[PDB]
Design a protein around this ligand. Structure first.
Ligand SMILES: [Cl-]
Length: 149
């Protein structure tokens, strides 16, 4: 094995033993470096009832280097690109090996209801979030419904 692979097995064991509310994930069948994950939208937010699928991509440099994470489900959120790529500060400059898959996934769930206003990846979503909360929620509701497909 390798340190990344042993760490990933530890991350999985910890996540499966004590999963945070509305989050789960596991390595793919055939490749511990690629995981499938699910995040349920947080209760009381525009994303409630959404069941969102994600892919997490690691390397042999984990946990020195953060993974990348993308939504496979359709998304509408200021910090998610059109291709599903998720922008999260802890996956960039605020990375620490103290974070693991569990805490990455919980951060992404929390991100859903707490957009980062700094240079958002989806300008349309950012502008609606800022200036037309009412309409932001309709656009979010459409991708909540699609997430059940
Ligand atoms: Cl962030």
């Amino acid at each position: 094995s390798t340190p990344a692979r042993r760490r990933l097995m530890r991350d999985f064991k910890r996540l499966q033993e004590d999963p945070p509310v509305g989050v789960s994930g596991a390595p793919s069948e055939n490749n511990i470096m690629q995981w499938n994950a699910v995040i349920f939208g947080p209760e009381g937010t525009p994303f409630e009832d959404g069941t969102f699928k994600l892919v997490i991509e690691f390397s042999e440099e984990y946990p020195n280097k953060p993974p990348t994470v993308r939504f496979l489900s359709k998304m509408f959120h200021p910090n998610v690109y059109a291709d599903g790529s998720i922008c999260l500060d802890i996956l960039q400059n605020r990375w620490s090996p103290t974070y693991d898959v569990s805490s990455i996934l919980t951060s992404i769930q929390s991100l859903l209801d707490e957009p980062n206003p700094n240079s958002p990846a989806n300008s349309q979503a950012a502008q609606l979030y800022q200036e037309n909360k009412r309409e932001y929620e309709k656009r979010v509701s459409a991708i909540v419904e699609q997430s059940w497909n």
